[PDB]
Structure formats: structure tokens, C-alpha cells
């Protein structure tokens, strides 16, 4: 058999994808993904930064789901600090994590359908993506890389009209999802290009470290928001969709259902969000108000010490994982008692999913390899740090 | 199965009854108002918290607010700021060199929220693409010109988030 190379440099498929395929005829026999083109030394750069200075690195890991990584990093720091977060901050974090989940799912579904050949749903979904990123631009000052979720509480408070605008969005996102489904779900070509492609058994998913939609499509009811709940996720009502055949079509139906349930969670968070402060009151770990630093001596001392040295995490090590839109995103943070992390491994779900591309694509058509790559929803920011 | 069900699903197979339902959906959006904006004339909505081009502010008396505390250079996660300071002829603590690498800047706003005197701010300007790499090495004069040119909008925005910061 010959040795064929797909390097798509154009971001019509990821952009830094490099597959070296061994094709017998039209079937592919082994898929070896060549990674390392987006390895920017993020893990080593964390060890040279303060715990506050290393927060923006997590925005650029999974650049389609930004708040998901910040939530995990903040939870790891809180676990190593035993820092309690106010209820309003927890509700805001859950709200902006479920907005993030919808953003990631909307991008993934349509960048996967564009690979197949469906161009129309891509623009329709990016319209709602822009509508959602407007909310990102409102709380923070950045459309994508918002350093909003922070270890103590949250960076700053919500503008006045944000809740009303988010409710107005949720009044029509259901019809938007209905249109997006009606363009793809009933189509026979979409069924023929997804059904029975990429079948994975539950044992294979467990052995290869699959998580999220890749794992729940095989029948495994494993959600980290229900197995190891964090924040206020245990006070919210939402269902966990589970697949039956493990193919690419189940990964798509579940990726629809997880976004409808995300809309449901967003509505509940809007309705039940309480009043109060948005940051922990231990100003030894959180910044003082700008009116208090210019009027009180100890507040100014705290500001000065926090914005140069930052806080010091007691010597310990732990692993915290959250339910990122791709799957289980974990951070292994090691502290030696100083103001800089000693070691911080980033466990990316894409790393464990692109590794299993070899067995998912074996004995499949060449044109069926792009659907297998797109159904895993891989971004290379996290695959190679 | 049932003859009626078999006939009904066989008609849909041969009459493409699930592609017409998508063609109608596309045609409905064809006759529909567009959502595109004329970028040169009309701009997209923004927020008062927008983190754009940096600017160094000055007091209404004409004195620059920067006190060379270097509190923004130590919080900068990208090491994009370099500050040199000395005692001015009056004896005041001021900067001689204040330059920002906008090719290293990640536009995170940490410098803006660490300044104790509201000297460095990220203004609303986001249209400053240059034709040369050295034009992106902003210095003290360039930053002060930015602060003077965007002073009113920056002041209004700082008034807006006074209730939040």
C-alpha cells in the first residue's frame, strides 16, 4: 500500500491537521496523526508566571470554549486554597460556562457539516455565535479571550441589560436549533454520510480515554456535572443524552441535545440568580475595590502585593476536572508554597480523541475520514500545548 | 410491515419529500432582510469595557498621571511593558521611557486594572493596523498622543465603569 499525506494548511479542516495515511485501495488502513505544529510550550511558560499571570494561557488552550478552561483553573486554585466562592459568582460562572458550551457546539456542528458539503448552516450558526459573543464582549472587554472567571470570584460584575438581552436570545435560540436540525437531521445524504461511520464500543471508549460526547455516544452515561458536580450544577435540572449505536450520527444527535439542555440550564440560571457580592471577601486573595484602594491603607497594600507578587498557594498537588464541551478537561496543579505554580499539566480531551483516530478510521473510505475527524470536535490549541 | 406504512415511506424515498422541506427552508431565508453591515460606514456594537489600543492619560491640569510605580510592568503576563524612571527636576517620580510592545501585548487589561492612578488605559480604538513592525513598538510619545486623541471617550467610559470598578 502507498503512503499518502493530508496536510490541510487551509482552515477548511482544522488548519494544522497532518495525517499520514496508509491506503490499500480506497480504504485507509492506518491513520498516524503528526502533532506538534501548535506546541507553543504553554506548560513550561506556566511555571514562570504568577497564578494570576497564568490565567490567560487557559483562554488560548481550547479557543472555541474559553470559559471552560478558566473555570477548571479557578476551581483547581480554589481547591488548593480552600477559598469559598459566593453564590452569585457561582451562578454567573455556570451561566457563562453553559453559554460557552453552546458556542462550542454551534461551531463544532457547522464546521463538521461544512466538511461534508453543507455550507448554509455554517453562516446561520455563526450569526447566533456572534449574538452570544456579544455577551462575552459585554461583561469583559474581549469577544473571545475573556479573563472573566478568576480564582477568587469573578473578575467584575454584569452590566444592567445583560440578563434581559440573554433572555431575549433564549426566546429564539430554540427556533434557531430547530432550523439547524431541519437542515441536516432529516436529510438522507446527511444520514448516509454519518450512519455507521466511526462506531466505537463502550469498552474501546473507556480504554482509549474517551470523554464527553465521544464516551456518551457509546451508551456510557458519564457526565462530570452529575458524577462529580461543581458550583451550583446540583441545583439545576437537566438531562444527560446517551447514544445507542456509537456512530457519527449519535454523536450529532447528542451534540444537539446537549445544547438544548444548555439552553435549559441558562434559563434556570437566569431565573434563580441571587444578589450579593461576586468575589470572595478574603482580600488576601482578591483585589480590593478601586474606591477602597484609593482611600484605605491596607486595601492599597493588598492591591500592591496582589498585582506584583500575587497570592501564594500552600504546598500541595491535586487534579481537578470539569465537563468541558469537548469532554473532561483536567488540570494537574502542583504547588511548592510560592507565588508561581511548580507544575501544571493540562489534560486535553482532544489529546485522547485524536489518539483514537487510528482505530476509528481503519477500513473506512477516504472521504469518511474527514467526518471522523470532525465528529470528535478537535482543536489543536489543546492537543499540543 | 403494514402496507400503508411501507407505501408511505416508499413514496418519500422516491419523491424526495425530505429535500423539498430543506429547499423551502432555504428559500424562506432567501426572501428575508440581510444581517450584514457596511463596515466603512456603520460599525458593529461595542461595550464601554472594550480593550483596544492603549493610551496614557494625563491630569486635566496637563500633568501626566503615570507615577513610574512599575505596577503595570510586573503584572503584565506577556512582558510587553518596559519602564525607565528617575527623579525629575521638580523631584517628582515620573517616567523617562514608557514603551509597550503591541506585538507581545495580549490585550488582557491587567495593566489597566493594576494602575493605582488610572494612567494606562485600553481605549476603544481597534483600527491601528500598521505597515511596519517598528510602528507597533509604541513609546511614551505615541501613548500620550493616543491618550490626548481619545481623552473624552476614555473619560466617559471610566465614568461608566466607576460604578463597577
Amino acid at each position: 500500500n502507498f503512503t499518502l499525506n493530508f496536510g490541510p494548511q487551509h482552515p477548511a479542516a482544522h488548519g494544522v491537521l497532518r495525517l499520514v495515511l496508509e491506503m490499500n485501495g480506497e480504504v485507509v488502513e492506518r491513520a498516524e496523526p503528526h502533532i506538534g505544529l501548535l506546541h507553543r510550550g504553554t506548560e513550561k511558560l506556566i511555571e514562570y508566571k504568577t497564578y494570576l499571570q497564568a490565567l490567560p494561557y487557559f483562554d488560548r488552550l481550547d479557543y472555541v470554549s474559553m470559559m471552560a478552561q478558566e473555570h477548571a483553573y479557578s476551581l483547581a486554585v480554589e481547591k488548593l486554597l480552600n477559598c469559598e466562592v459566593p453564590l452569585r459568582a457561582q451562578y454567573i460562572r455556570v451561566l457563562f460556562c453553559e453559554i460557552t458550551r453552546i458556542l462550542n457546539h454551534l461551531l463544532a456542528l457547522t464546521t463538521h457539516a461544512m466538511d461534508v458539503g453543507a455550507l448554509t448552516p455554517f453562516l446561520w450558526a455563526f450569526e447566533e455565535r456572534e449574538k452570544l459573543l456579544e455577551f462575552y464582549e459585554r461583561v469583559s472587554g474581549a469577544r473571545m479571550h475573556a479573563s472573566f472567571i478568576r480564582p477568587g470570584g469573578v473578575a467584575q460584575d454584569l452590566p444592567l441589560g445583560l440578563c434581559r438581552d440573554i433572555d431575549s436570545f433564549t426566546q429564539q435560540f430554540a427556533s434557531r436549533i430547530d432550523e439547524l436540525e431541519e437542515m441536516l437531521t432529516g436529510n438522507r445524504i446527511w444520514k448516509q454520510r454519518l450512519v455507521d461511520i466511526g462506531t466505537v464500543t463502550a469498552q474501546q471508549a473507556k480504554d482509549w480515554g474517551f470523554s464527553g460526547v465521544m464516551l456518551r455516544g457509546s451508551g456510557v452515561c458519564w457526565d462530570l456535572r452529575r458524577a462529580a458536580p461543581y458550583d451550583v450544577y446540583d441545583q439545576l435540572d437537566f438531562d444527560v443524552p446517551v447514544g445507542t449505536r456509537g456512530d457519527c450520527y449519535d454523536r450529532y444527535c447528542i451534540r444537539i441535545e446537549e445544547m438544548r439542555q444548555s439552553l435549559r440550564i441558562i434559563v434556570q440560571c437566569l431565573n434563580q440568580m441571587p444578589s450579593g457580592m461576586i468575589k470572595a471577601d478574603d482580600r488576601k486573595l482578591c483585589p480590593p475595590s478601586r474606591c477602597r484602594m484609593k482611600l484605605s491603607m491596607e486595601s492599597l497594600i493588598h492591591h500592591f502585593e496582589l498585582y506584583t507578587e500575587g497570592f501564594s498557594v500552600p504546598a500541595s498537588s491535586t487534579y481537578t476536572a470539569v465537563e468541558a464541551p469537548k469532554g473532561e478537561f483536567g488540570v494537574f496543579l502542583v504547588s511548592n508554597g510560592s507565588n508561581r505554580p511548580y507544575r501544571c499539566k493540562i489534560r486535553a480531551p482532544g489529546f485522547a480523541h485524536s489518539q483514537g483516530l487510528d482505530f476509528m478510521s481503519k477500513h473506512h473510505m477516504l472521504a469518511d475520514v474527514v467526518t471522523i475527524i470532525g465528529t470528535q470536535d478537535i482543536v489543536f490549541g489543546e492537543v499540543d500545548r | 410491515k403494514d402496507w400503508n406504512t411501507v407505501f408511505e415511506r416508499s413514496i418519500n424515498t422516491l419523491f424526495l419529500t425530505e429535500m423539498v422541506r430543506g429547499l423551502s427552508l432555504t428559500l424562506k431565508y432567501f426572501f428575508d432582510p440581510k444581517v450584514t453591515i457596511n463596515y466603512p460606514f456603520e460599525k458593529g456594537p461595542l461595550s464601554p469595557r472594550f480593550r483596544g489600543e492603549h493610551a496614557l492619560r494625563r491630569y486635566p491640569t496637563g500633568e501626566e498621571r503615570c507615577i513610574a510605580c512599575k505596577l503595570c510592568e510586573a503584572v503584565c503576563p506577556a512582558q510587553a511593558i518596559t519602564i525607565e524612571a528617575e527623579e525629575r527636576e521638580d523631584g517628582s517620580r515620573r517616567t523617562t521611557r514608557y514603551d509597550i510592545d503591541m506585538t507581545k501585548c495580549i490585550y488582557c487589561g491587567f495593566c489597566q486594572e493594576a494602575c493605582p492612578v488610572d494612567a494606562i488605559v485600553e481605549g476603544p480604538n481597534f483600527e491601528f493596523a500598521t505597515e511596519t513592525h517598528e510602528e507597533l513598538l509604541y513609546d511614551k510619545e505615541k501613548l500620550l498622543e493616543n491618550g490626548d486623541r481619545w481623552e473624552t471617550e476614555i473619560a466617559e467610559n471610566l465614568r461608566s465603569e466607576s460604578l463597577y470598578r
Binding site: 427556533s175 431541519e182 438544548r260 437566569l270 431565573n271 | 408511505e8
Partner: peptide, 27 residues
Amino acid sequence: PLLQDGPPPGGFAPVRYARRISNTGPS
């Protein structure tokens, strides 16, 4: 201050989240 972002009194109006059926066509 004491005027903080949140839901209006009585909560927000209910919003559909399930699939809406479409029975279009003579068949």
C-alpha cells in the same frame, strides 16, 4: 450599589426548548 443586575420581579417568561414539529406536505 444596591441596584444590581438580575431577573425582574416575578421572574422571566417561560421559553420553549424542545423540538417543534413540522407537518408540512400533502404526501
